[PDB]
Amino acid sequence: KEELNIIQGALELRTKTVEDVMTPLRDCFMITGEAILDFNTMSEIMESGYTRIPVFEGERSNIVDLLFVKDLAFVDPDDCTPLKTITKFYNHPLHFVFNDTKLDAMLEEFKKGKSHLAIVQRVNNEGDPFYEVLGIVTLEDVIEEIIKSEILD
Amino acid sequence: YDLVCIGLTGSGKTSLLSKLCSTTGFSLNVKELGGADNIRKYWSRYYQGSQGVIFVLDSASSEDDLEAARNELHSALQHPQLCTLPFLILNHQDKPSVQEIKKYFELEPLARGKRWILQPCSLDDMDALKDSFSQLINLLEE
């Protein structure tokens, strides 16, 4: 009956990890540090719909800053302001979470409301082991998973 | 207890930490991160699973280095993984101005109402460091 759907959803959530629901790096919309916030780039940014865009330097796995769409409401597209100005001025925090982190803990990290996007990194391994960037995860993703489980209502 | 230490002079700070045990990466489980300019941007890759921070700043350093220390402390203060945690702010054994640090770091207005402690410490003063760490552990117990 209904309790069956409840238990199934709870099991699906408990088993699910952030790695399962994250968007892998190949699908993530990003932007390089060398970019300039001219008229064309703002069209490309405003069309993707993402509110927060990771900003990398050199490689897509080397994330150095975050870009907020609300920060692009006051900019004029003719001055051709470089991205470095906005990034260095705002300097938003960068959230890093491991791939093995579970839905509940990662969800607890968002509860403060100080952040909405984290970067999923893996403990990779010869050669000296390192952190490997897999993708990005958002509060929206975990909430979409929870409502997709149809537990509530 | 997992703690993180970030500060200028990353090898200098790891030497100050080695003085307690009788760098440029992952090192009471205190992980000391490097203080080089390039590694400061990648600092945030290690903050997960921390219960407190030990921020070290060279008060005797040049004005620009002090500016970098103030900016780094401000970035650490508002990080979601570190904002809810208590962390202690500590420099050299002998120095040629805690009030100046409070006024210029703007830690009175912003750093208000949370379990944060700015305490003096010197490499030649072991007992003062012990008392500062005792206060930090007392905050960690909350």
Could you give the number of structural domains in chain A? 1
Contact B75 A131 (CB under 8 A): no
E strands, A9-116, are 23-24, 31-32, 36-37, 52-57, 59-68, 81-82, 95-98
Q: Nearest 5 degrees, angle CA A107-CA B1-CA B55? A: 90
* CB proximity under 8 Å: B 104-133 to A: none
* CB proximity under 8 Å: B 33-92 to A: 41, 44-48, 75, 78-81, 83-84
How is residue B78 written in tokens? 């508002």
* Pair type for strands B2-7 and B52-56: parallel
DSSP per residue over B38-100, as a string? Answer: HHHHHGGGS-SS-SEEEEE--TTS-HHHHHHHHHHHHHHHT-HHHHTS-EEE---SS---HHH
Question: What distance lies between CA B113 and its chain's CA centroid?
Answer: 19
B31 contacts in chain A (CB < 8 Å)? none
Q: Is B106 left (phi over 0), alpha (psi -120 to 50) or beta?
A: left
B9 neighbors B59 (Cβ within 8 angstroms): no
Spatial distance between the Cα atoms of A126 and A138, rounded to a whole number of angstroms: 34
A147 neighbors A6 (Cβ within 8 angstroms): no
Phi, psi of A102 (to 5 degrees): -90, 165
Nearest CB to B75 within list A91, A110, A115? A91
Annotated binding-site residue numbers of B for GTP: 7-14, 32-36, 91-94
Taken in order B10, B12, B18, B19, the sign of the CA dihedral is: negative
- Residue A109's SS3 state is helix
Q: In what order do the strands lie in the sheet with A52-57?
A: A31-32, A52-57, A59-68
Nearest CB to A93 within list B41, B80, B84? B80
CA of A119 to nearest chain B CA: how many angstroms apart?
9
Could you give the number of structural domains in chain B? 1
CA of B24 to nearest chain A CA: how many angstroms apart?
13
Q: How far is CA B118 from CA A4, A111, B97, B102, in A?
A: 54, 28, 12, 9
Burial group, residue A83, by CB count within 10 angstroms (0-12, 13-18, 19+): buried
Domain that holds residue A24: 1-153
Nearest CB to B80 within list A101, A109, A131? A109
Resolution in A: 3.2
Report the chain B residue with the minimal C-alpha distance to residue A122: B45
Contact A114 B75 (CB under 8 A): no
Domain that holds residue B66: 1-142
Spatial distance between the Cα atoms of A30 and A56, rounded to a whole number of angstroms: 7
Experimental technique of record: X-ray
Spatial distance between the Cα atoms of B122 and B94, rounded to a whole number of angstroms: 7
B48 contacts in chain A (CB < 8 Å)? 96-98, 101
Phi, psi of A141 (to 5 degrees): -65, -45
Nearest CB to A98 within list B48, B78, B84? B48
